[PDB]
A paper describes a structure:
IMPDH performs the rate-limiting, first step in de novo GTP biosynthesis, the NAD+-dependent conversion of inosine monophosphate (IMP) to xanthosine monophosphate (XMP) via a two-step oxidation and hydrolysis reaction. The catalytic mechanism of IMPDH involves a transition from a dehydrogenase to a hydrolase reaction; initially, the substrate IMP and cofactor NAD+ bind, IMP is then oxidized and forms a covalent transition state complex E-XMP* via a catalytic cysteine, while NAD+ is simultaneously reduced to NADH. The enzyme then undergoes a conformational change whereby a large mobile flap folds into the vacant NAD+ site, carrying a catalytic arginine residue that activates a water molecule to hydrolyze the E-XMP* covalent complex, releasing XMP.
To provide a foundation for fungus-specific inhibitor development, we determined the crystal structure of the clinically relevant [name] var. grubii IMPDH in complex with the substrate IMP and the inhibitor MPA. CnImd1 forms a tetramer and in the final model each monomer contains 395 of the 544 residues in the typical eight-stranded α/β barrel structure, plus one molecule each of IMP and MPA bound in the active site, consistent with our functional observations suggesting an uncompetitive mechanism of enzyme inhibition. The large accessory subdomain between residues 130–244 and residues 438–449 from the mobile flap have no interpretable electron density, common to previous structural studies on this class of enzymes. In particular, T347 (Cryptococcus numbering) faces away from the active site in the Cryptococcus enzyme and does not bind MPA, while several other residues including N317, D288 and G340 participate in fewer interactions with the ligands in the cryptococcal complex. Of note, one of the two residues responsible for MPA resistance in C. gattii VGIV IMPDH, R336 (K336 in the resistant enzyme), forms direct contacts with only IMP in the cryptococcal complex, suggesting a possible mechanistic explanation for the failure of the R336K single mutant to exhibit any altered sensitivity to MPA. The change in orientation of the loop in CnImd1 creates a large, Cryptococcus-specific pocket in the active site. The cryptococcal IMPDH structure is unique in having most of the mobile flap, except for 12 residues that encompass a small insertion region unique to Cryptococcus, sufficiently ordered to permit all but three residues corresponding to the flap in human IMPDH to be observed.
Numbering used by the authors:
A (entry chain A), B (entry chain A), C (entry chain A), D (entry chain A): 4 to 129, 245 to 437, 450 to 525
């Protein structure tokens, strides 16, 4: 028998009974999210490996809510976080993105004093109705990243003093005793500063950080545009499967998940959210913008900015597959210093003032096509099997 | 045991018993259409992902009937519809294609008056024995596209007055309350003008439009040659699976299906029909022809015409993967204006007078190779499992 | 439980018991031929899609017999047939290949008189111990191709008179009433001239031609190096699956199978034979050689010969993916004339006197690596599951 | 029901119970090694086809032991063996690699006297705490390769006299009666010189060599960077599946396995070991280094060294896919001489003194990410299912 359709009728059916006959089918058209994200059946999937199937439209795209949670206590009007990278997020980006309803995560490749001064400028900043404002203060929300070394405790204290709302524990692999203990330390020292723990790609890693007290999870290992060629990497996970697996588990505890790495367009954003992510983090997509740090320069007629991985030799010196313009494939500088990312340049993207509304509109249109009015409904329909998917072959 | 063959004989079998032994096999060679088009087993398929297996020939290719239904009331001698695009279909293309036994769908990127004047020229037009003539009038058949906004009701009235036979409701996603209500409006206002509803890629979407009163379904979402790179798209479906899934359902109600987008050669046409489509719609294949609108121009020694998506910035301004000659990858012009297609150019293809007979002959030869004499038999054999298929890997 | 291995031992096993423990495994390492060639499990496979796993060597490569049957009555020392193509086989190639133990199939893109004169030169021809000699006459074996039109009956009579040993019924799809009736005609007129029928890619097609009285089967549809891009083709089959499926059935009746098309190297030959083919047919591999017809010419410093498909506009005028040097992508010349292949050029390959011994030696070495001493043993081990295979992914 | 997750809870779960809920899951996230390396389910896999999933970190990377066994009696601090190739290993490389904790295998493309003189220089050689020293002598360990022809018996005697610790039986296919008998000959003549037998890619081949008395297995057939394009090869196996299949069996007898061929970066090393290999062999990665044999020369501005396969026409004359700088695709020189590899050049890599510590550090970091402290634990976790994997699609 046909497992995808009921037996064919003997004679033509009445078109007015089409909706009744649709209910006789053994399963929905395409795949459920649970069927798509099966490691044994389909392997590890990236965003480009599948599509979301269209649903029913009964609302304009302007009615779509993109409201989501970055952490268990932080609600954002736009599910966009800028990456804590020295060529992506400083105070200018953190302010601009917050004004558009997103959230900036200021990098830590500077002294704790310089970082605290950047956090302070975001918090003190004074047309933008979607603005990410802290409810009782009306100040813009501010995030920042730190490592999990003993000296990071003192760094966080200066950041807390500067008015920090949320902290990102910056790591290629957050499932360590060092990060687990550091989370517990923040939960006891600063209970009001939300903790985004990671990076994680497995359910087992997520469970450790959820139990430690993480308020949000940063998902991704090897997915970044400036990440060393994956043919050179041994440990990681394809981003789609990573986003699904972690959020499938984390959502049971109400812990929002941030899809970090490999977001190159609106489609990637829609797909990451459709997989269970509550928000996305962008490095590459926000690099080369006016609000990003670093100077513009010309490279063979093109106006560019440097965009680099934080594990690149250049970023580590205290001063790679999918990528825009150019890049250099470095591997080592010191035998002890193993490069984990690349340094290159990205073309001028203009201001985020024009770019972020484009991403916002495009995402409302994508959710409308899927028949979805909110991120909450997107997730609910993904878990129920109402929201359908289809794998795409090479061609 | 071997599920594909019976046990091997102890000694050689007699070649005169080959046909008797063939009936001992547990299944036919290759795959049935139902086995090929399994989302869980094979993922989403495009035309290039499979082949049709050859059958038995007992007729010349000239005996193959390519007669099919564009809608439940319109019978065409050639299953070819030209796309409603400003660089594909105006009156010249609608007349020429109709004379060859096909059907032209005039675009709506003009005033309702200009569009009605184009429809009128097709209807008034007065060597071509395959000609798509309306039975009781002997005039050439004419199709036209419209949107589903309130002002489109008035547009259709001017088109109806001009002698319009069939209307295409022009949309990237036709499963909306706006289109469903617009179909019901046409069925009550103009019961004699056939409605082609869409675009649709799922069985669930098809059911809504069939129940509303659609006379034909336009299938495709993201398959078009001028469609924005699918790595940028979030919602859609691979064309083969879309064509199969929709026609598997629609054929139960006698609603013909039009395979729209990604037809680049005869093989694509044969495969779309073999999947269950009653006809194909061509944009790219018919662009650059003498009968298509727009002027010829030279681009670095090559005689070309512009070919563009209707969702391109250039088409929207009221004046991308698989593609001929050149293209530009636009994404936005206005933050509110999100590009859904690209504008490029296509090489001179000559007249359709030489081109359409080539497509017709080639398609008769393809059906002959499969052992098929008509579109009706092609479908019957596809559903029975007599017509076989084979998936093709990357190599 | 693990379906590929028995439970792991509690403590280390004795290395002297390795052969005893090997027999405790639930299945052989890798895949059986029946497991590899499963359409539902693996799709349609080409030669590049898999490898043959190595076996046990207990003989030198020089002990490998490459003796096989081209037809049920013709035994060849070398399983190589040259293709009946106007740029591959005339009398010079037919003589040279026969002297090396193979078999030439003279083309029919000439008058029946010219073709009969070429057959006669092979038969009259008078260092080469592997020579394909007819047993009771000591003359070189000669093959020739014909179509299945009424005028081909008279062509075959002139060829029979010239001393023809074997006839190839030349067709892109041999499963027709025209070929079936033509086979019966030859079996009754010339019972002593072996018939190679085809081309075929399915078990169902093979059964028809076996029942008609074919002495050998020519396998391939769309596999040829000069064959129109498969993205343009609708009907055919990946060569590996075609070779397997047809020979799995044909071998039950003792009908040898010729793997025709897509042989570009020794590995392809070994794989075609390992799949069940009794011999291979080469067009591309034998084009550009001294013995092939047509003049050498220079093309931008390179010494070349034309190599073209018999369905190309140039071959049809009575005078495309995998290919050497250059090619032109023609599609039509006359609306009635649909191109089925391409015309291009191939680099000078030298004489077959140096080339054929290279292919012979290489093939002995391949069979030795698989632990196989003869074509008969290769087939026996392929059917028993002793000969193992492995699918290869893209990387 | 969902086979990958338990039913979803009715209301939110407590994050402090995350570790308890994790134990309710029907299976671990991702795949077990046994699930990944299933030929019927996933086909033949190379290193690039999968990733290792991250585990739990509770130690610094500097605490990772890379100590492993090259043979049943030889313990190495670094699991690196240099390939016995005339452009990779002579005395300089054997000494340098041994000093870094690895093991050099001196080539045999020289007289037995010259080879014995190279072995002697390694053994007589007199800052390096990881040094591969023979326990009772304090001399550096030395390996060497030989063939299995009668004259190789006399070659080994001169090598034994020179102080040889381990012998590699050099072959593209070691499962022969010639190698099996040669192993037994060494076991009886020189019981104290460890035998590395191969090359092997199947469990059936491994069983023969284990039963003969091999102390280690050299795994690989067609995986080498200088190996003739695999589209030309008929017999072999994808490296990942080869490494897994052989080590799954060999580990039951305590016979270490050497992953030989296709190691181009640290990730490949980590993956080969994670699959069950006890060590890796490098040709390409160690060619172009100061310690490798052959002179540096300039090729269009680049400082290079020749790197060639031992089956290349140039290496055989007693004087190809994945590859650095350049290469030539030779196939034959003499009709009897069939090329099995290519000759090309590789860019200057500098000294191994800087390169080997880079590889060592990188590998400690990879094992740390997987939550693994030693090679022994890596294997134990791979067999238990604690160490997880994920397949990677093309994108
Ligand atoms: C910390 O920044 C990252 C992140 C977030 C990720 C990756 C990565 O390589 C680096 C650079 C790694 C550096 C700076 C070394 C320190 C470390 O390893 O923590 C990645 O692979 O997944 C996510
Ligand atoms: C309407 O024209 C199409 C069609 C038929 C399709 C697609 C598409 O993008 C456009 C352009 C979209 C435009 C003009 C915006 C309006 C809208 O969205 O209806 C496609 O993806 O599937 C089919
Ligand atoms: C006859 O020569 C071939 C053969 C053997 C094959 C193919 C093919 O296209 C042609 C050219 C087709 C021509 C000359 C037209 C006549 C016909 O169709 O018989 C192929 O696809 O599979 C095998
Ligand atoms: C012996 O060196 C190798 C090895 C180790 C391998 C291959 C190979 O081709 C050669 C060259 C083959 C030559 C010198 C001919 C002799 C022979 O065949 O033994 C390979 O494919 O897997 C591993
Ligand atoms: O050097 C690096 N190597 C690997 N990943 C990095 C590195 N630097 C930053 N990342 C990660 O990649 C992300 C950015 O990815 P992108 O948006 O694809 O450009 C960051 O948020 C980090 O998770
Ligand atoms: O701008 C666009 N974006 C995506 N699809 C479009 C656009 N314009 C037209 N289409 C669709 O693509 C089809 C043409 O596809 P083509 O024959 O592959 O060139 C049309 O019939 C429409 O369905
Ligand atoms: O024009 C053509 N189109 C498709 N196949 C052809 C044509 N001409 C010859 N062939 C076939 O392809 C074979 C040669 O393939 P080759 O060895 O790959 O070059 C012939 O033996 C025929 O089966
Ligand atoms: O000529 C050859 N053909 C195929 N493989 C070879 C040849 N020469 C050496 N090899 C093998 O390939 C290995 C080197 O692989 P590499 O590290 O990928 O460059 C050697 O250790 C051998 O197993």
């Amino acid at each position: 028998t046909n497992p995808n359709a009921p037996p064919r009728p003997d004679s033509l059916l009445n078109p007015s009974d089409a909706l009744k006959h649709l209910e006789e089918y053994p399963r929905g058209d395409g795949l459920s999210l649970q069927e798509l994200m099966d490691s044994r059946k389909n392997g590890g999937l990236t965003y480009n490996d599948f599509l979301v199937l269209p649903g029913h439209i009964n609302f304009p795209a302007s009615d779509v809510s993109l409201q989501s949670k970055a952490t268990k206590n932080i609600v954002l009007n736009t599910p966009f976080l800028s990456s804590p990278m020295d060529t992506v997020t400083e105070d200018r980006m953190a302010i601009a993105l917050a004004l558009h309803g997103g959230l900036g995560i200021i990098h830590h490749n500077c002294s704790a004093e310089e970082q605290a001064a950047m956090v302070r400028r975001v918090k003190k900043y004074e047309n933008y109705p979607y603005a990410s404002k802290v409810p009782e203060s009306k100040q813009l929300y501010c995030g920042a990243a730190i490592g999990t070394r003993p000296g990071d405790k003192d760094r966080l204290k200066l950041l807390a003093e500067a008015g920090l709302d949320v902290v990102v524990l910056d790591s290629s692999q957050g499932n360590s005793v060092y990060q687990i203990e550091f989370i517990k330390w923040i939960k006891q020292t600063y209970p009001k500063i939300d903790v985004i723990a990671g990076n994680v790609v497995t359910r087992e890693q997520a469970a450790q950080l959820i139990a430690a007290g993480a308020d949000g999870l940063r998902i991704g290992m090897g997915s970044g545009s400036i990440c060393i060629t994956q043919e050179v990497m041994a440990v990681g996970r394809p981003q789609g499967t990573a986003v699904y697996a972690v959020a499938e588990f984390a959502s049971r505890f109400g812990i929002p998940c941030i899809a970090d790495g490999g977001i190159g367009n609106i489609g990637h954003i829609a797909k990451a959210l459709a997989l269970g992510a509550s928000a996305v983090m962008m490095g590459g997509l926000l690099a080369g913008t006016t609000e990003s740090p670093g100077e513009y320069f010309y490279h063979e007629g093109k106006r560019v900015k440097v965009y680099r991985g934080m594990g690149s030799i250049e970023a580590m010196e205290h001063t790679g597959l999918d990528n825009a313009a150019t890049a250099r494939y470095f591997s080592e500088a010191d035998a002890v210093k193993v490069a984990q990312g690349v340094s290159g340049d990205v073309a001028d993207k203009g201001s985020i003032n024009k770019f972020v509304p484009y991403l916002f509109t495009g995402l409302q249109h994508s959710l409308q096509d899927a028949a979805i009015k909110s991120v909450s409904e997107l997730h609910s329909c993904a878990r129920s099997g109402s929201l359908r998917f289809e794998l795409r072959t090479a061609s």
